[PDB]
Symmetry: C6
Subunit: 218 residues, 6 copies
C-alpha cells in the first residue's frame, strides 16, 4: 500500500542520488538561485540528458537568452544543441520579447505535442505572481510534462525566490547557491522540498566543469 | 482540566500534554516543505482510523487529487476514506463568508469532529482570520490551520497577527546548521493548558511525522 | 501632595519588582509576543483584587469570549464563574460585530460593580492619539488598569506601533526567549512615571497557580 | 578666563555641568533624546527647578502630552514641590497637551515675557519636521531663552531621534540611554555635540534616585 | 562551432583569472561602490585595446565630461587626447546639460565611424531590466565587446542597484573596496561568464600609477 | 600644464595634506560627509580660514541653516576671528538659511558666482527624490568647476558604517569624498577621517584618527 510517486532520472551526476531517483514525473520543479549559480545549465542538462540517454525529446522555453546564445553557451560543455534541434529532438521555444500567459502556454502545448516532448525547461506585485505562477504549474501538470522552472533570487540565505511565494506554489524546490566566505565561493545544491516523496536533505557541494554540473553527495 | 483530542502524531500528544484542545483552533506555521500539510492530513487520518472521528480537509491551492496522491507516499489510502464518507476534501483551490458556510455544511453532512485548513491589509487578515476561528469555535470543530512564513526565526506567520488570533500555536522549523537541515516542532502556546516548551526534533519518514520529546 | 501610591497585585514577586504594586489610578501597559502570559497577568490582577481585597474587577475582552476566559482560568484553580455569579467580576465582551462608546460602557460597568481594578485585553499617528485618549479617560474615572498589547520580537520595539510605550505612564514587558532549544520567560518593568521600581529582566514561570516570578531578593 | 567661546548656564544636575564643561550654552537649544523612561522629562524638569531654586531664574515648561497635574504629581517622587513654584509665579507650566505651531510659539513667547523666564523646557514629513524644528529653535534663540527640548528614539544605538533630522538642526545634542545587556539595565548620558566648545565625550553612567538625576563623570 | 572566444584586456592579472579575457561580442557588467576603480577598468580596457592591438574604442560617459576623463587618465601616464586626435578613441558625451534608442544609435554611429571593436559604458526595476536587456542585445547584434559599469552601495549586498542588472548581463565582474579594522582592501571578482570558465572568488588588486594590478593570491 | 595630472591645494589642516598627498584637487569639489557633530563645519571653515591666512586666497562660505553670526561665534572656539576677515573683504559668508517664519538652486548658484567674482575667491565651502538629488547636485558641482572654484561640500549621514551620505547618490556625483566618523567603541568615542576617493590622483587609504582642539582638526600620523 506504500506507493511511491514516480521519478524521472536527470542523469546529472549525483543529483539522482540526492533526489532518490530523479525529478517527480509529471510535475514542476523550481530551481532557484542568484546569478551565475547554474540555473540554465541545470535546465539544459535536464533536457540534453533526456534526449541523449532516453530518447525523450525536450522543449526549452526561453524568456531572455536568445536561442542562438543558449546553443552557443551549451558548447562550453561539448553539447551540440543545434544538431538536436536539426533532428527535431530538441525544440527551443523563443518567448523572449523583441528588442499574455494563456498564449504562451498553448504555444508550449503545441510544441510539446509536435515534438512528443516529455521534459520541459522554462528559463526563467506578490499577489499576481503567486496566482499566475500557480496556473502555469497547473496547466503543465495537465499536459503530463515533467518541468524544470528556473527563478532568480538575490540572497544566498534569504527567500527561496524573488517574491516569497514561488517556493510555496511549486511542488518541488531545488536551491542553487554560490556562497562567498573568506573571499572564496562554494557552489551547493539543495533539494528543499519534494512533495509526496523522500530526498536527501541540506546542501551538497557541486562544481561546474567542462562536463556540466557535478554534485558530490560526498 | 480542558478536554484534548489525540493527534496520534508520534510524540506530539506528549508535547501538548494530551493532544489538541477540543473545540479550538491550532495554527501550524512553517517555511516551505516543513511538514504543514502532512501534519494536517495526519491529524484527520488518525482521527478517522483510530477513533472513527470524521474529518474535513480544506485546500486552497493543492488539488484534492494531489493531496490523495501525495498521501499514498505514507501508505494512507485517502480515496477509500472519501468513498466511505469518513473524509471529505473541500476544494477551495483555483468570499470568506461563503467558504465558512461551505465548511459548516461539510461538517454537518459528514459529522466531522476534525477540520484541517491548509494554507491583504494588516488587520483585514486579523479580522477575517478572527472571523473564521470564531465560527469554527461556535460549530465546535477542532481545527488545524496551516500558514506560511518565510524565516525560521522571524515572525510566526506572514502577517504578524495570525498567532495572536489562534488559541494554539505550533511552529515547524527546518533550520540550517552548517550545511545540514534539522526539523523541529515547537508548541509556542496552548491557551488554558500546560504543554512542553521550546523546540523538539522530528523526522518525516514513510510513516509520517515522528517527533522525539525527552 | 505626595508621590503616587501603589496597589498590590499580590502576584508573587511582582510587588517586590514594582516596589509596592501598580501605580494607583493609572494604566500599566503589559506587552509581549504570543503566549507570553499577558492575559494571565491581567486576569491574575483582577482575581487577586477580588480574593485579597474585595476589590471588584472589570475584564474587557476584545477577542476571547467570556466563556473561554473562564474556561482558560480553570487550569489555575481560579473559579471565575463563581466570581462572575457573585457580582465581583464582570467580563465585558467588547468583541466587535469609536472607543468613545467603549469608554462609557467601561465606566458603566465600573460603577455598577464598584470596580477598583480594570484589565483591557488587548496608522501610527492615530494609534498614539487614540491610546492617549483611553489612558486619559480611564485616569479620570480613577480606575487602576492593566492593558495588554502585542509585540513581535523579544528584544525589539516595546509594542507594535512604536508609540504605545511613550503614551503610557507605566510599562511592563513579558518575554519568552529561546535559550538553546529551550524557552525562558522573563518580566521587566521598563518604567513607572513618578515612582521607583527594580530594573532589567526577572525570570518567571507559569504554573498551576499562575505567574510565579523570582527576584533573588 | 575660562577659555571657551560659548557662555553656559549651570544645570546644577550632579555631574552634567562637568561633562558639558560648564552647563548648557546660553540662548541656545539643547536636544535631549532617549527611549521610553530614560529620564527625559526628569532632566528637563530638574533643569528648570534648579534654575529657580539656585539662581531664582524663572522657567517655562511646555508639555505636549503629560498634563500639568501629572507633571507636578510625578515630580513629588523627588521631593520637589512644583505647585508651590507655580503659585509663586516662578514656574509656568504651559499646557499644550491635547483635549481628552506658529500660535504655540506666541504662547511660549508670551509666557516667557510674562514670567521673565530664563530657562525653557519643551517636552517633547522629515522635509517639514526639519524646517518646523528649525523654526522653533530659531525663535527661542531670538527671544534669548535657553532651551531643553526632549525627543523620542526607539533604539539605544541607532537614530539620534525619530526623523533623522533633529540632531542636525539642534545646536547641542544629549542622548539618554537605557541599555539592556545580560538581562540588566544601565543608564548612561552622552553629550554628542555642543557647537562652539569642547565637552566630555562618550557615555557616562547615571542613576535616577529620590534626588533626581545623578551623573558620574569619570575621565 | 565551438565555445565562446575571449578578448585580452592586458590588465595584469585579469586575463589569467578570466582565462583569456572578456568574452568577445558580449557585455560585461562591472559593478562597485564609489571609487572602486570602475571607470579605470573601463578606460584601461579601451586603452590597452588601442595600444596593444590597434583596436579602436568608444567610451560612453553619462556624467564625467570628456575633458575630466582625459585629465584623470593623466594620473596613469595615459594620453587619451592624443588617441582621440588620432581617431583611435572616441569619448561620446551623453552627459546631461532618457531615450535609450537614440543613445544606442549614437553608439552604433560611433562604432561604425571609428571601426571600434571595444566599447565602455560608464555608468522601476521592470523598466531598468527591459532597457538594459535592449541595450545589451543591441551591442551584441553590432558585434561590440562591451564593459558596462554600475553602482552599488554595499560591498557584500546586491550586485548592482536595481537587483536585475546581474541577471540580464552575460558577464559580471564585482569590484570591492572593503573597510575592515580601519583599513581598505580592494578586490576583484569574476562572478559569472556565461558559456565559459573563470577563476572564482575575490582577488586582491591595487590601483597605482600604471593602472589596475590584480594579484593571484 | 593641463597635460599634467590634477594638481592639489594645501588645506594646511594638520595631517590632511599628508593623507591626500598634497591637499584637495584644485578646481574640484570634495564631499565631506559625517554624522552629527563629526566636525564637518569645522573642516569646511578651516579650509577657508587657512586659505586666507596662509595663502591670501579669499573664501566664500555658503551656509544653509547656521546663521553667519553663529558661524562666526562658534569659530572663536578655534581661535579664529572670522568677523575680522569678513571686514577686510577676505571672507564672505553667504546666508542661504531659511527665514524663521521649491528652492531655486539655479538662482542660488548665480548668487554664489557673483560672490566668488566680487571677493575673487579661490576656495568655497558649502554647508551643507534620489533622481532629483542626483541631478541637482550634478549641476551645482558642474557649475563650480566651470567657475574654477575649489570647493568643500558637506553632507549628513546617519550611520558611521552605513551609506556615505543621505540619498545614496552624493558619493557618485562628487569627484572627491572624505568621510568623518565618530565611532562609539565601548562607551568611548573615536573620531576618524578617511579619504574614500579622489578622482584622477592618489591618496592614503582607510581611517585615520583625529581630534578637534582649540586649534581645530588634528589628524594623527599613521
Ligand atoms: N515518504 C517520505 N519519506 C520521507 N520524507 C517524505 C516522504 N514524503 C514526503 N516527505 C517529505 O515531506 C515534505 C513535504 O511535506 P509537506 O507536508 O507537503 O510540507 P509543507 O510544509 O505543506 O510544504 P508546502 O505546502 O509545499 S510550502 C517533502 O518535502 C519531503 O521532504
Ligand atoms: N496550568 C498551566 N500550567 C502551566 N502553563 C500554563 C497553564 N495554563 C496555561 N499555561 C501557559 O500559559 C500560556 C497562555 O498564556 P496567556 O496569558 O493566555 O498568553 P497571552 O500572552 O495572552 O497570549 P495570547 O493572547 O494568546 S497572544 C499557554 O501558552 C501555556 O503556556
Ligand atoms: N524616586 C525615584 N527613584 C528612582 N527612580 C525613580 C524615581 N522616580 C522616578 N524614577 C524613575 O524615573 C523614570 C521616569 O523618567 P521620566 O523622566 O518620566 O522618563 P521619560 O524619558 O520622560 O519617559 P516617557 O516620557 O514616559 S517616554 C521611571 O521610569 C523610574 O524608573
Ligand atoms: N575648542 C574645542 N575643542 C574641542 N572640541 C571642540 C572645540 N570646539 C568645538 N569642539 C567640538 O566640535 C564639535 C562641533 O563640530 P562641527 O564642525 O560644528 O560639527 P558638524 O559636523 O558640522 O555638526 P552639525 O552641523 O551641528 S550636525 C562639537 O560638538 C565639539 O565636540
Ligand atoms: N566549461 C566550463 N567550465 C567551468 N565552468 C563553466 C564552464 N562553462 C560555464 N561555466 C560556469 O557556468 C556559469 C554559467 O551558468 P549558467 O547556468 O549560465 O548560470 P545561470 O544561473 O543560469 O546564470 P544567469 O542566467 O546569467 S543569472 C558561468 O558563470 C561559469 O562559472
Ligand atoms: N596615480 C594613482 N595612484 C593610485 N591610485 C590612484 C591614482 N589615480 C587614481 N587613483 C585611485 O583611483 C580612484 C578612482 O578610480 P575610478 O576608476 O575613478 O573609480 P570609480 O569606481 O569610477 O569611482 P566613481 O565613478 O567616482 S563612483 C581614486 O579614488 C584613487 O584612489
Ligand atoms: Cl565551480
Ligand atoms: Cl526528515
Ligand atoms: Cl513556564
Ligand atoms: Cl537608575
Ligand atoms: Cl590601491
Ligand atoms: Cl576630539
Ligand atoms: Mg540563466
Ligand atoms: Mg503544504
Ligand atoms: Mg491573551
Ligand atoms: Mg517624559
Ligand atoms: Mg567612475
Ligand atoms: Mg555643521
Amino acid at each position: 500500500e506504500h506507493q511511491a510517486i514516480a521519478k524521472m532520472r536527470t542523469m546529472i551526476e549525483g543529483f539522482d542520488d540526492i533526489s532518490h531517483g530523479g525529478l517527480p514525473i509529471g510535475r514542476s520543479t523550481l530551481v532557484s538561485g542568484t546569478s551565475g549559480t547554474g540555473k540554465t545549465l541545470f535546465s539544459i542538462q535536464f533536457l540534453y540528458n533526456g534526449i541523449i540517454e532516453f530518447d525523450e525529446p525536450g522543449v526549452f522555453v526561453t524568456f531572455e537568452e536568445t536561442p542562438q546564445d543558449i546553443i552557443k553557451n551549451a558548447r562550453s560543455f561539448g553539447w551540440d544543441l543545434a544538431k538536436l534541434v536539426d533532428e527535431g529532438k530538441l525544440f527551443i521555444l523563443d518567448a523572449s520579447p523583441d528588442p499574455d500567459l494563456s498564449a504562451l502556454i498553448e504555444r508550449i502545448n503545441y510544441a510539446i505535442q509536435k515534438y512528443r516532448a516529455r521534459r520541459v525547461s522554462i528559463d526563467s506585485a506578490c499577489s499576481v505572481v503567486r496566482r499566475e505562477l500557480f496556473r502555469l504549474v497547473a496547466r503543465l501538470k495537465q499536459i503530463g510534462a515533467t518541468t524544470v522552472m528556473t527563478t532568480e533570487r538575490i540572497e544566498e540565505y534569504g527567500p527561496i525566490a524573488r517574491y516569497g511565494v514561488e517556493e510555496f506554489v511549486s511542488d518541488n524546490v531545488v536551491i542553487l547557491r554560490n556562497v562567498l566566505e573568506g573571499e572564496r565561493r562554494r557552489r551547493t545544491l539543495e533539494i528543499l522540498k519534494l512533495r509526496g516523496t523522500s530526498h536527501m536533505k541540506g546542501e551538497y557541494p557541486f562544481t561546474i566543469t567542462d562536463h556540466g554540473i557535478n554534485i558530490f553527495p560526498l
